Design an enzyme around this catalytic site. Structure first.
Site, PDB file in Angstrom:
ATOM      1  CB  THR A  72      12.401  26.118  73.218  1.00  0.00           C
ATOM      2  OG1 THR A  72      12.816  27.398  73.708  1.00  0.00           O
ATOM      3  CG2 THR A  72      13.415  25.782  72.067  1.00  0.00           C
ATOM      4  N   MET A  73      10.648  23.815  72.383  1.00  0.00           N
ATOM      5  CA  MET A  73      10.213  22.624  71.674  1.00  0.00           C
ATOM      6  C   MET A  73       8.751  22.871  71.312  1.00  0.00           C
ATOM      7  NE  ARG A  74       9.742  25.806  66.268  1.00  0.00           N
ATOM      8  CZ  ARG A  74      10.774  25.513  65.476  1.00  0.00           C
ATOM      9  NH1 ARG A  74      11.551  24.451  65.694  1.00  0.00           N
ATOM     10  NH2 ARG A  74      11.048  26.318  64.456  1.00  0.00           N
ATOM     11  NE  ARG A  75       9.417  19.459  65.667  1.00  0.00           N
ATOM     12  CZ  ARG A  75       9.492  20.698  65.146  1.00  0.00           C
ATOM     13  NH1 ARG A  75       8.614  21.653  65.458  1.00  0.00           N
ATOM     14  NH2 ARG A  75      10.476  20.982  64.316  1.00  0.00           N
ATOM     15  NE  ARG A 245       8.580  27.905  61.348  1.00  0.00           N
ATOM     16  CZ  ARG A 245       9.804  27.365  61.314  1.00  0.00           C
ATOM     17  NH1 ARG A 245      10.864  28.056  60.874  1.00  0.00           N
ATOM     18  NH2 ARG A 245       9.973  26.103  61.717  1.00  0.00           N
TER      19      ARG A 245
END
Ligand SMILES: CC1(C)S[C@@H]2[C@H](NC(=O)[C@@H](N)c3ccccc3)C(=O)N2[C@H]1C(=O)O
Ligand SMILES: [Fe+3]
Length: 277
Positions: A72-75, A245
């Site tokens: 979820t954390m796309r970091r 986005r």
């Protein structure tokens, strides 16, 4: 019949040149290479060099401190420890191995975001589109940058074409020593390869372009072909993909959305971006 991908300079477009060629391209292809927007092979090489540096020479503990806590954390990073490595960042909540890393990658992000706003501005102007609340609020958004490095070694589940969930997307790639083009899309009913091109950046339009321009812009289906067990002598490569986005609160009328051929994932009259994920 028509499977070629045009190049345009952004400066030239901003001066009203090539209006028809560009209008038609958007409607019939949704993709194009682009020169003279403020990116450089060099900027890219240096951001890349710094990441690869870390990949190879980073302490085991340093690496833990910036590996992504959950998908979820796309970091932060993924796939660098003890089918490839990957670094992701957005406007905030980013993770950073060092101070010079912060500076180079923060600047590379801003540059990519400035360019991708510029292109988007041009796509709206070419199709006479003023989204609700104005071009600038729309374009001031929640973007994401995924960089991805495929290292070498010497000792395959073909995924299916997709369109992107973006207003626009920008790709810069370093090439393969062996000429292998891992990136393909559908242009006029055929698969066309999309190589690294000198001082050009590849631009896909996405779903949101189609939606926001009332149907005027195509969002091409494309896929990343992996290489087989035969063309891997010299197939290290990278790509840098930047997803412009929209803000979660953006909205679109659902009659128009399914009218194209996109996943009807909600049962309503109109809807927003965030829930559609
Ligand atoms: C191969 C690609 C260039 S496109 C593909 C895919 N793009 C999307 O589906 C995008 N809309 C998305 C991203 C993340 C979460 C939800 C949706 C993605 O991610 N892959 C890129 C990559 O290399 O990282
Ligand atoms: Fe994609």
């Amino acid at each position: 019949m028509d499977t070629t991908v045009p190049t345009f300079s952004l400066a030239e477009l901003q001066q009203g040149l090539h209006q028809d060629e560009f209008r038609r391209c958007l409607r019939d292809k949704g993709l194009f290479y682009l020169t003279d927007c403020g990116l450089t092979d060099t900027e890219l090489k240096s951001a890349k060099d710094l990441v690869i540096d870390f990949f190879e020479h980073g302490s085991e503990a340093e690496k833990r401190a910036v590996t992504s806590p959950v998908p979820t954390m796309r970091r932060g990073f993924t796939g660098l420890e003890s089918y490839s490595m990957c670094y992701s960042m957005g406007t905030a909540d980013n993770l950073f191995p060092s101070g010079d890393f912060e500076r180079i990658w923060t600047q590379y992000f801003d540059r990519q975001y400035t360019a991708s706003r510029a292109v988007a501005r041009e796509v709206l102007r070419a199709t006479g589109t003023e989204p609700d609340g104005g071009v600038e609020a729309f374009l001031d958004c929640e973007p994401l940058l995924r960089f991805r490095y495929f290292p070498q070694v010497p000792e395959p589940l073909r995924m299916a074409p997709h369109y992107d969930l973006s207003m626009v997307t920008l790709i810069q790639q370093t090439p393969c020593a062996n000429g292998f083009v891992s990136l393909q899309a559908e242009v006029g009913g055929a698969f066309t390869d999309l190589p690294y091109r000198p001082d050009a950046v590849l631009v896909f339009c996405g779903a949101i372009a189609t939606l926001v321009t009332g149907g005027q812009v195509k969002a091409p289906r494309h896929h990343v072909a992996a290489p087989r067990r035969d063309q891997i002598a010299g197939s290290s490569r990278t790509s840098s993909v930047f997803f412009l986005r929209p803000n979660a609160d953006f909205t679109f009328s659902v009659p128009l959305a399914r009218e194209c051929g996109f996943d009807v994932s909600l049962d309503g009259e109109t809807a927003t971006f965030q829930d559609w994920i």
